[PDB]
Design a protein around this ligand. Structure first.
Ligand SMILES: Nc1nc2c(ncn2[C@@H]2O[C@H](COP(=O)(O)OP(=O)(O)OP(=O)(O)O)[C@@H](O)[C@H]2O)c(=O)[nH]1
Ligand SMILES: Nc1nc2c(ncn2[C@@H]2O[C@H](COP(=O)(O)OP(=O)(O)OP(=O)(O)O)[C@@H](O)[C@H]2O)c(=O)[nH]1
Ligand SMILES: Nc1nc2c(ncn2[C@@H]2O[C@H](COP(=O)(O)OP(=O)(O)OP(=O)(O)O)[C@@H](O)[C@H]2O)c(=O)[nH]1
Ligand SMILES: Nc1nc2c(ncn2[C@@H]2O[C@H](COP(=O)(O)OP(=O)(O)O)[C@@H](O)[C@H]2O)c(=O)[nH]1
Ligand SMILES: [Mg+2]
Ligand SMILES: [Mg+2]
Ligand SMILES: [Mg+2]
Lengths: 431, 432, 136, 431, 431
């Protein structure tokens, strides 16, 4: 019934997956061994004859280290060994090694495992793909997998949770190249992609959680919370639900313009105790303020095309409509003229669950806004500019060419990004 | 002309339909188990129009509950009168329509349609004298809208000589639940113009405005809107379910209300207007009930009746009152407001009085108008459709389902011809 | 003062007469089609039934055209999805083969460069051997 | 023996029939079970069975069962045999075309078969009395279908009508003028004499003379039955005027098309009123020349008489009648056409006026019904023709008739025949 | 990416290589017998990168010791950690190369090369996931230089997809009087430009200057110079040897450090600078490490980094310190010294922090720079080469071994093109 298959690619994808699946288990009362003492969680967990609940997920990495931690860790009994797939050598921060050289060795094995997971689905909605833009596996292997999924599953819905690079935590100088190549190759294969800018998350952790030097553990717990909000509508039966298809219909006005901005509220430190409880109006207002955004950009300088509000906890429809109506009277929040009605609402009963010993405080109500704003084009411009700086000198290009890639692929990828920036510009113009 | 077969499709259709069944069950003295516990023979005289008599003393709604999503069906079963429905009459899919008319009409809907028709055929073949069908649905979503109109066309094909009646809820940005409502409504209106005999235009714009402006509800909910819908549905169906002379069946109502085949979109009116919480109220006289006919504030469609002309009107008065006073007050309103009634349809206002008032009120009035002002509702939808269509916004979700742009152009053109047709009769004179 | 009374009939529960106030000013009493036929009636009723049946058939002909269009949209979506699969499959096979060709070419060029270095080394060895022994 | 068969078509015809047959039973001393503790003339309207029971020579027809279901479950269920109460399942929905062409075709043979069985029991069949509304689809559509077939099966056998002319105070369909003109055109050459009953005239008499604030069909029908009884009294009792159906025609119809006599009845007195002195012959005769006592609204001052019949009932003496006629002629014009003498055919039927016990009418010692053929009745056709013209010019509601197989040309044909009828009334009155 | 295969060729190669093995064995807690006696799981996590696990608790360096002269082998076996090496991995000739690159590359070296490849193939085929090779040698002599580069080409032919890394010691007239060193260095640089992926330029000119000027050692010995080499070698391999995110393997390091294939010559830097076996009891602070590590006085190549621009930089901090302080200090240095970093390679400085400090220090910093200033080292060699080549001095030493003058002209031309290429990127602008 209404299943969703999750695929976690490379270090970022796998580590975010660890945080997501840990949180889902806490939310549904599933123990680390798959045992549990609603019914909707079945969209994400299959059940065995022994009453054990197994994630509908595949974890893939070209190197074994990160997944080796999953198969030796707390949740080793949660996943069956066949759904944790590892090669021997990674893509060395090279898209070409991920997509071709190293990736072509494990691709058939990964598709064989997803095929076995899809065979256990009676109402497959599609795929949720988690990966970074920057790594050789997250960039190259993801694009290879995305193309192969379009072949085997045609138009079946494919949504991404993509980690947008930040220099504070970056491991490769070539991340802008890997980001542009994966974006060009995946564009026609993805229906909707939720970018998460590592700098935005890094700044929220520093500013809101008082973490001097945020680690991936800090970043991923916060990321896990946003993912869980986007997926709670599928994993629970609440006051107002929103499925995979409804997300595309309500957030994607044109096939290429498929990158919603996520904004989460409230993010409160595990100290204080006075900094709550925030009202529905207060948390909704916080969604339109730039500090709570998952991607760094300025919406005041852009136009909204679609807005989806996903509430969780002690939230009533009357409270929500009151908050959306005040947002409607706000001159500083502008919507495109070709959009008479821009709001889509999800409401779930369960307050946001926090990982014991985590940085986040327990809140009575939270919200995740997904908005398609032309302001997100600023994130593409910053990436495109870093690409241009290096590409003008062909700096590092030889590493990709050595793996059989052609310079023409770089030009093609960059021209497609230029057309994407041009599309965001055209979409924001009035008729 | 005895039995009516009721169909409820999608979230809105099921919510409004469930409210209709609880309001009419209370009026006919039927409890949530199906047992009659009333104290008036008038309550049972025409019970068979909406209820089948099952084994023993029990009455079962001749209702089919449809959705592409399971959740709504659960919510109905869990409702106050949830257990009154036939369990085999709940027909639901497992994957919704994603607020996409094309998925409701061509893909997911088409896959569920035969399971629905099998249930409607079972109910229809059991009828001694089938009047036809009553469908409750919204036009803004995917299931009620796309699948609801697919059902209408499939039903028209199998029962071409039966009356097709709808309670169609029109979308509004004021209380909206999807960005593509203008597309879904225009594609549905095109279907309704061609395939229904009579449609009650229930406008969320008007319901929101009544709650906000008149009822002084700062933040109206679907609960507040549905309280006006259910009062309207009870009022417009009074003549079908209680003994009387006027518009006693779906065909006699259509013959009196529809002068031109495409002009079958009714503007409902109701007085007194009340809020769920307003358990006061102590008021309303016959002249007071009558004055609300031309009152735009009492219209369930967001159109000003004084911006057009009435082709035909059905007026239903409920409670204990003088039939003499009603006749005088009704004649006065027509004579005083001569300019808002077409002169080329003589005696175009028909009045009925039912002794049984609805619950909570001692006196009520329901208006059913076929007004040329309904063109304002269609123009509002057309302008919202055009703002999106001009830029081909969200169009890939429809063409992705196999649809062509031409269907959009055709639906828009047909709705604008409907507007042009209303305007033609608005300007016509008895120069004869 | 003048009135002419003409007795007409007398019966058990009645009596009748004619009262004349004035004779007609104009003398000479006043100043049609058949039948009809059952055949003529039947012909008209049958003609009306044929008109009713013809219009119901036209409504059905149009509803069947809608069913045909419904199948055609379902088919169009099947075809577009199939062509999407076919397109992605060939683009991907071309990309994987072109990349294979280029990578093996780069590896061949570098091994050939190293092999030439070996040829040069044996030629250097030859010269040393021409200098060594064959002098002193 | 000279038998008359009564045919009651549709709701109005059936309900008026209930009132007429209830009154006939009271007049002849027949109980609701058909028993009578027995001047032989009542046999023209009632046949006799082997069990000594008296059965109306009548057929009740409706395309829907509700109204007749009341007759077969009511007080007079034993008066009629089941075979003479004929119903279909679905009515004509106020559509002449539906009553005539669609549904009517299904029950016509059955009705004629029942009529034939009643005619077989007659030794001197005079003809038919047909009761129906102009406004309903059965009353209009089925009646004209039946009248045509009766002319085929009973060639040159008398057919008289008691037709309910529509009034908006009690109307149930906007389309009543269409149905009225369609039935009048089709029935014209098939009817010998028709007594129209304008529902507004009856409604006004009930309001004014009976002090009924809001008259019901029960009030209207009791009054209508009194006039029907006045007209039929000399067929059912050994009278001297209008002794046979052929005599109505001879006495009132000088030209076949101008066959619509005007009925004027007096006195109509409230039962729930203070004891009063009985009205004299002069007073009731004077009431015959008052437009307020008419069964159709029209102005006899705007027309010319071509025949006048005075039908007295009860304690009436010829000497008092002649003196009353002599005084009227002195004060009033009472203008006749050039070719007709200025006079009256007078009949006294000694049988007392009878009222339903507990009804709205007071029992009176003497009453009178004047039947006059005046050109003023053309005013009733003009009012109907004008309402037809208003709607027809726009083809309003026409699609409902066309949908049943009627041709638009039938509306024109029917209206042209009404125009020729109005022209006939004008031409007949000229000199 | 696990195993690295280490090769030590000639006197300098073996002396610096032996020092590397004693320094890293102490860091990983390995004694001269091969037994682990440490007290931290971090020491063994990546032990397999440099050591094979032999029968029992013993760890054996994956090291091959090569020389055309036997004496050095004896000196290595007699050294502190001499017994840790695999006896079969010592491959020694009897003749020597007499500071002649041609003898090492074409003659005597070619006669010993197959015995070396026997041993390298055995070590390589035993690898689960071979990263590649690390060669230590001088460029000024005959074996390390000529045979070392011959080994590079032979190994590359059999392992073309593995990373080739060198620690190449550049000659200086300050430490060696051998007149032919510029020829041997130029002939070797020509080989390195074409056949290595990454080369650490360890300059004897800079080592001598540090010992004389900073350490105040009037007459430095190879022991004094080698102490700076071993501190550098420990520092630059820290990321390969301990768990971490940055430059964790030879390929990821090359991808981050090498923007153009030929420009793979690194300028290493270290802080604090110390003399042999000397205390201590005053650890440098983070701002001090950050400043000192980017100073001309701390560079292991005799080039002023302020005379060029950094293409890429890897900075490694070792010891217990604040990662926040390191991030601030590192950002400050690149914002303040903007002009010494190319603007067309964004975020070209990558920082790593390892908790384990080297022995004798509580805190240390190692810098790996790809700087355009390294052209000063190549120009110094080229000027010394040309002064000799212009007069064809000592040419018969090389032509006597079968070499032609053209190889000298080609090597010189290739090195001058490398200088011209560094200058091109030094002058390039983002614009
Ligand atoms: N938010 C977040 N980002 C991560 C995490 N791990 C790595 N990244 C980011 O993702 C990028 C590095 O890509 P990775 O996912 O580590 O590399 P990979 O997909 O394994 O690809 P290869 O190692 O080159 O085969 C840099 O931007 C990192 O900052 C994580 O756990 N959370
Ligand atoms: N006087 C009188 N008029 C009646 C009565 N019933 C109906 N009418 C009038 O007759 C017209 C309606 O026609 P009906 O006789 O009810 O309809 P019908 O012949 O049964 O035809 P359908 O129902 O359309 O099949 C309106 O003018 C009514 O006011 C009645 O009992 N008495
Ligand atoms: N830093 C350092 N340099 C050295 C050492 N030993 C020799 N050198 C330098 O290395 C170069 C001399 O080359 P060698 O290593 O002795 O030559 P080799 O590889 O043994 O080759 P041949 O003796 O010619 O067969 C000169 O630049 C010396 O300064 C040492 O231990 N440390
Ligand atoms: N009046 C009213 N409108 C509703 C209700 N629920 C949803 N709607 C409206 O119906 C449209 C959304 O369509 P809906 O029936 O929920 O989608 P569906 O389940 O695909 O048919 C919008 O115009 C909503 O405002 C309700 O309970 N009452
Ligand atoms: Mg990785
Ligand atoms: Mg009827
Ligand atoms: Mg030596």
């Amino acid at each position: 019934m209404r299943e969703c298959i999750s695929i976690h690619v490379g270090q970022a994808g796998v580590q975010i997956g660890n945080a997501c699946w840990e949180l889902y288990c806490l939310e549904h009362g599933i123990q680390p061994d798959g045992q549990m003492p609603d019914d909707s969680f079945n969209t994400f967990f299959s059940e065995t004859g022994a009453g054990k609940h197994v994630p509908r997920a595949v974890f893939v990495d070209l190197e074994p280290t990160v997944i080796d931690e999953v198969r030796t860790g707390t949740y080793r009994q949660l996943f069956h060994p066949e759904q944790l797939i590892t090669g021997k050598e990674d893509a060395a921060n090279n898209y070409a090694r991920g997509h071709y050289t190293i990736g072509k060795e494990i691709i058939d094995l990964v598709l064989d495992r997803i095929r076995k997971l899809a065979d256990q689905c009676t109402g497959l909605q599609g795929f949720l793909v988690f990966h970074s833009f920057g790594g050789g596996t997250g960039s190259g292997f993801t694009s290879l997998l995305m193309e192969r999924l379009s072949v085997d599953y045609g138009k079946k819905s494919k949504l991404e949770f993509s980690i947008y690079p930040a220099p504070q935590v970056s491991t490769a100088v070539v991340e802008p190249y890997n980001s542009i190549l994966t974006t060009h190759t995946t564009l026609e294969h993805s229906d909707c992609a939720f970018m998460v800018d590592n700098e935005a998350i890094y700044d929220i952790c520093r500013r809101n959680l008082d973490i001097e030097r945020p680690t991936y553990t800090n970043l991923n717990r916060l990321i896990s919370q946003i993912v869980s909000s986007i997926t709670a509508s599928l994993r629970f039966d609440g006051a107002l639900n929103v499925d995979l298809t409804e997300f595309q219909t309500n957030l994607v006005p044109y096939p290429r313009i498929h990158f919603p901005l996520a904004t989460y509220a409230p993010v409160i430190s595990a100290e204080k105790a006075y900094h709550e409880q925030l009202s529905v109006a207060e948390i909704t207002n916080a969604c339109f303020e730039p500090a709570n955004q998952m991607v760094k950009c300025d919406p005041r300088h852009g136009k909204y095309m679609a807005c989806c509000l996903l509430y969780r906890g002690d939230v009533v429809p009357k409270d929500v409509n009151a908050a959306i109506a005040t947002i409607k009277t706000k001159r500083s929040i502008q919507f495109v003229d070709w959009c008479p009605t821009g709001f889509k609402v999800g409401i779930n009963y369960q307050p946001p669950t926090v990982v014991p010993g985590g940085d986040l405080a327990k809140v009575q109500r939270a919200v995740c806004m997904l908005s398609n704003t032309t302001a997100i084009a600023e994130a593409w411009a910053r990436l495109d500019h870093k690409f241009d700086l290096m590409y003008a000198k062909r700096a590092f290009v030889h590493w990709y060419v050595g793996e059989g890639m052609e310079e023409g692929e770089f030009s093609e990828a960059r021209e497609d990004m230029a057309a994407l920036e041009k599309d965001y510009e055209e979409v924001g113009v009035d008729s | 002309m005895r039995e009516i077969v009721h169909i409820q499709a999608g979230q809105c259709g099921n919510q409004i339909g469930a409210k209709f069944w609880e309001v009419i069950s209370d009026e006919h003295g039927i409890d949530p188990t199906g047992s009659y516990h009333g104290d008036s023979d008038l309550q049972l005289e025409r019970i068979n129009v909406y209820y089948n008599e099952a084994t023993g003393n029990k009455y079962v709604p001749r209702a089919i509950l449809v959705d592409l999503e399971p959740g709504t069906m659960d919510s109905v079963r869990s409702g106050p009168f949830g257990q009154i429905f036939r369990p085999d009459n709940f027909v639901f899919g497992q994957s919704g329509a994603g607020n996409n008319w094309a998925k409701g009409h061509y893909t997911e809907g088409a896959e569920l349609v035969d399971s629905v028709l099998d249930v409607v055929r079972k109910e229809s073949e059991s009828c001694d004298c089938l009047q036809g069908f009553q469908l409750t649905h919204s036009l803004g979503g995917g299931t009620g809208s796309g699948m609801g109109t697919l059902l209408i066309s499939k039903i028209r094909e199998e029962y071409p000589d039966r009356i097709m009646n709808t309670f169609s809820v029109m979308p509004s940005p004021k209380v909206s639940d999807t960005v593509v409502e203008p597309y879904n409504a225009t594609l549905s209106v095109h279907q309704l113009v061609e395939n229904t005999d009579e449609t009650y235009s229930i406008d969320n714009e008007a319901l929101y405005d009544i709650c906000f402006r008149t009822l002084k509800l700062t933040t109206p909910t679907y609960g507040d809107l549905n309280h006006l819908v259910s009062a309207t549905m009870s009022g417009v169906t009074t003549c079908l379910r209680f003994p009387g002379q006027l518009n006693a069946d779906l065909r006699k109502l259509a013959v009196n209300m529809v002068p031109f085949p495409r002009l079958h979109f009714f503007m409902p009116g109701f007085a007194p207007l009340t809020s769920r919480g307003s358990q006061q109220y102590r008021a309303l006289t016959v002249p007071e009930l009558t004055q609300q006919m031309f009152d735009s504030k009492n219209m369930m469609a967001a159109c000003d009746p004084r911006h057009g002309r009435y082709l035909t009107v059905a007026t239903i008065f409920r409670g204990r009152m003088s039939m003499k006073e009603v006749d005088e007050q009704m004649l006065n309103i027509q004579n005083k407001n001569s300019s808002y009634f077409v002169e080329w349809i003589p005696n175009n206002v028909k009045t009925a009085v039912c002794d049984i008032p609805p619950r909570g009120l001692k006196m009520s009035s329901t208006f059913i108008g076929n007004s040329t002002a309904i063109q304002e509702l269609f123009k509002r939808i057309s302008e919202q459709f055009t703002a999106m269509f001009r830029r081909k916004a969200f169009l890939h979700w429809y063409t992705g389902e196999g649809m062509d742009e031409m269907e959009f152009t055709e639906a828009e053109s047909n709705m604008n011809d409907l507007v042009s047709e209303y305007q033609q009769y608005q300007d016509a004179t008895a120069d004869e | 003062a003048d009135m002419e009374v003409i007795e007409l009939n007398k019966a058990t529960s009645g009596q009748s007469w004619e009262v004349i106030l004035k004779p007609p000013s104009f003398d000479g009493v006043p100043e049609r089609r058949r039948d009809p036929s059952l055949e003529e009636i039947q012909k008209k009723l049958e003609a009306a039934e044929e008109r009713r049946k013809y219009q119901e058939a036209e409504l059905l002909k149009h509803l069947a055209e809608k069913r045909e269009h419904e199948r055609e949209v379902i088919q169009k979506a099947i075809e577009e999805n199939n062509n999407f699969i076919k397109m992605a499959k060939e683009k991907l096979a071309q990309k994987m083969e072109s990349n294979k060709e280029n990578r093996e070419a780069h590896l061949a060029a570098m091994l050939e460069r190293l092999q030439e270095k070996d040829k040069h080394a044996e030629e250097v060895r030859k010269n040393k051997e021409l200098k060594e022994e064959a002098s002193r």
